[PDB]
Write a protein that holds these residues in place. Structure first.
Motif, PDB file in Angstrom:
ATOM      1  N   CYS A 161       0.678  -1.382   0.023  1.00 36.56           N
ATOM      2  CA  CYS A 161       0.220   0.257   0.270  1.00 36.56           C
ATOM      3  C   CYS A 161       1.142   1.063   0.268  1.00 36.56           C
ATOM      4  O   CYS A 161       2.480   1.133   0.078  1.00 36.56           O
ATOM      5  CB  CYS A 161      -1.291   0.054   1.069  1.00 36.56           C
ATOM      6  N   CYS A 163       0.764   3.114   2.853  1.00 35.86           N
ATOM      7  CA  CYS A 163       1.490   3.272   3.542  1.00 35.86           C
ATOM      8  C   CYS A 163       3.156   2.968   3.869  1.00 35.86           C
ATOM      9  O   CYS A 163       3.445   2.681   5.616  1.00 35.86           O
ATOM     10  CB  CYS A 163       0.848   3.398   4.998  1.00 35.86           C
ATOM     11  N   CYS A 178      -6.834  -1.221   3.136  1.00 35.79           N
ATOM     12  CA  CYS A 178      -6.014  -1.679   3.348  1.00 35.79           C
ATOM     13  C   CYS A 178      -6.244  -1.783   5.348  1.00 35.79           C
ATOM     14  O   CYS A 178      -7.395  -1.694   5.814  1.00 35.79           O
ATOM     15  CB  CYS A 178      -4.866  -0.548   3.392  1.00 35.79           C
ATOM     16  N   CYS A 181      -4.214   1.947   6.951  1.00 38.04           N
ATOM     17  CA  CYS A 181      -4.555   3.222   7.365  1.00 38.04           C
ATOM     18  C   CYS A 181      -6.004   3.421   6.229  1.00 38.04           C
ATOM     19  O   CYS A 181      -6.243   4.212   6.454  1.00 38.04           O
ATOM     20  CB  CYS A 181      -3.967   3.905   5.763  1.00 38.04           C
TER      21      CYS A 181
HETATM   22 ZN   LIG Z   1      -1.889   1.127   4.132  1.00 42.51          ZN
END
Ligand SMILES: [Zn+2]
Ligand SMILES: [Zn+2]
Ligand SMILES: [Zn+2]
Ligand SMILES: [Zn+2]
Lengths: 374, 378
Positions: A161, A163, A178, A181
């Protein structure tokens, strides 16, 4: 336990199927569904109920160490009893098999298709979030290396992802949200990888040959052995654009390399790489194994040229069984009755032109015979 | 020696090809052509020139005893050198093969097709004189039993002239003139034999299934084993008119017959004591490709929905380690390894220690292939 089958799809993976059964039948997750499924197999006296996993990741029958035969009996028991209309669940699983590739790579099987074992993904499964929000499930092609782009959206797959966290749909559902996040993952455009992805999916992709799906993965494993590296999408499509005279160009360059680097030359000393690395990919069906079908086409018109260079190449009794597809007991019988003309099994006593013509005499089949490359 | 290829035909037999090469190249018969062919193989130092026959009867490589590998090297040498344009002569010969049928019948192979050995004609070859005067050659289908009518003229084949003498085209030419009376042979009309003849020829014949030619002869050998007699053309077409529920009707009647006449405790029942005839007589016909072997593909379809019915009657049938390798298509070394690591749960190889439901699910776990797997009869 009484369940309801969701919308069936013949390309859905097994791990994506148990998530959709649990979500339709009102369970919390898939961990709960498999743990309630193990409880049902105990109640009807199944022999291997205690080996049925509560982990979605190890569900497939290749995961089971000794529960492989009890796992498929468990999968066959669920489809016959717990549903209003019987589903297809054995056809979505990835079973082990006794089939080997060349030279010694093992294989797995999913329904009507045989995959290489080394191309099976085991660390992190990529996904396409556009298919997750349109089709509503996941495909089996995401579990195998080489399939890097979507064959219907032409977008690269995602393993991480925005993040920094990975996204595995087996542990994070089928929605595309996800874990850290709790946001949808932002996407990350070529053509050569798009052609192979549409070719590995089972559709006609030119200039790649029209092969069954068991054989299309065999060419990808074979192409990684020629370059002796990872798979390259650009040189793979270009190699079959000049078929078959590009493959003829390699074999000429290999025999010119091994002659320069002659009655003592062996088959493993001149064609040890190309011949033994193309026998079983997955099998010897020359109608669909176009590599072994064209290599025997090239060596047929060169047997007694150059004072019989190819036809005088030495062979053992071990590597005679690899070409003839027989055993060492039939080889030892054909030195008793002497259909084959000369025991030490690792001794070089036979010539390649005699083994090639013994195959045309006593060892053809309906699939492995010369009548396809004519 | 320099020769000319005649008009090529992919259905011409090998014995009919050497007659047409000799007649085009101005030889007297086929006896003086094979004898001149043996003279050429001597002159270019072939290893098995002395085993090349002068008889047109034994020209096929199954007739050669030890020189079958030298015969096909002789056939490959002639097609590359002695012709202006290379013919196809290995594709017309009848080679031996290591393939066995069920239970132990051997087999022969002709190009892209595998024949049963027991259905090969060896006494007298019948012929159709209408094809001899229109096509100008003979077909390979006249060498095999079951093919009784012509698939394009619907006339029965002939083995005897009107004067009592037989007519073999290998010794009497391709014209259709008898030897004693030197006259053309007078002919000797059903439908059920016409359908099988059009089916064995390779065309679509209904209600018979669309199979490859290697498998269509396997059903004819299998149908002779069910009735335990010679081949019947009338009951064969009727059996596939009610496919698959006619074949389901036999298996129900066999398990009802065997259970009633069982000599052992229902728990001591073996796989050879209940399904010893149908299962072992349908494994290799010619092989285990369930996409085309519709007998083994439907028998495993019937036994899948009956494993744990009747308190697990089918799934508790005893098996040996010998007959486990027949179903799994493996060896006794892998069986002895799977009792060491115990993927398979219990050594005397002829001992009944395994159940059929465990062997059937071990195959779905460790022994599927791209041709022998369950995904075709779904
Ligand atoms: Zn994420
Ligand atoms: Zn996608
Ligand atoms: Zn006809
Ligand atoms: Zn007459």
């Amino acid at each position: 336990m009484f369940l309801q089958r969701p919308k069936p799809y013949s390309d859905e993976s097994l791990e994506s199927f148990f998530i959709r059964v649990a979500n339709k039948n009102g369970y919390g997750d898939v961990h709960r569904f498999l743990e309630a499924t193990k409880r049902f197999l105990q109640d009807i006296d199944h022999n291997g109920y205690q080996t049925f996993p509560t982990d979605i990741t190890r569900i497939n029958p290749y995961s089971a160490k000794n529960s492989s035969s009890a796992r498929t009996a468990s999968f066959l028991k669920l489809a016959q009893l717990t549903f209003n209309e019987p589903p297809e669940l054995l056809g979505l699983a990835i079973n082990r098999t006794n089939m080997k590739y060349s030279p010694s790579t093992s294989a797995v099987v999913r329904g009507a298709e045989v995959f290489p074992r080394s191309l099976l993904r085991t660390h992190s499964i990529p996904c396409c979030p556009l298919c997750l929000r349109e089709n509503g499930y996941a495909s089996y092609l995401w579990h195998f290396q080489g399939y890097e782009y979507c064959h219907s959206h032409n977008v690269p797959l995602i393993t991480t992802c925005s993040c920094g966290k990975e996204f595995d749909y087996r542990v994070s559902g089928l929605k595309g949200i996800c874990c850290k996040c709790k946001e949808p993952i932002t996407l990350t455009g070529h053509e050569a990888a798009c052609t192979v992805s549409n070719w590995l999916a089972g559709h006609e992709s030119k200039p790649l040959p029209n092969l069954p799906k068991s054989y299309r993965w065999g060419l990808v494993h074979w192409w990684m052995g020629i370059k002796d590296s990872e798979f390259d999408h650009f040189s793979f499509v270009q190699f079959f654009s000049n078929w078959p005279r590009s493959f003829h160009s390699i074999i000429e360059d290999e025999v010119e390399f091994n002659l320069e680097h002659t009655s003592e030359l062996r088959l493993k000393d001149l064609l040890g790489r190309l011949f033994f690395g193309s026998i079983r990919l997955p099998e010897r069906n020359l109608q669909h194994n176009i590599i072994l079908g064209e290599l025997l086409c090239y060596l047929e018109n060169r047997l007694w040229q150059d004072k019989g260079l190819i036809a005088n190449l030495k062979m053992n009794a071990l590597e005679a069984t690899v070409m003839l597809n027989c055993s060492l007991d039939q080889i030892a019988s054909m030195v008793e009755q002497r259909i084959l003309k000369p025991l030490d099994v690792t001794d070089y006593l036979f010539h390649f032109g005699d083994i090639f013509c013994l195959w045309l005499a006593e060892f053809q089949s309906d699939e492995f015979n010369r009548s396809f490359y004519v």
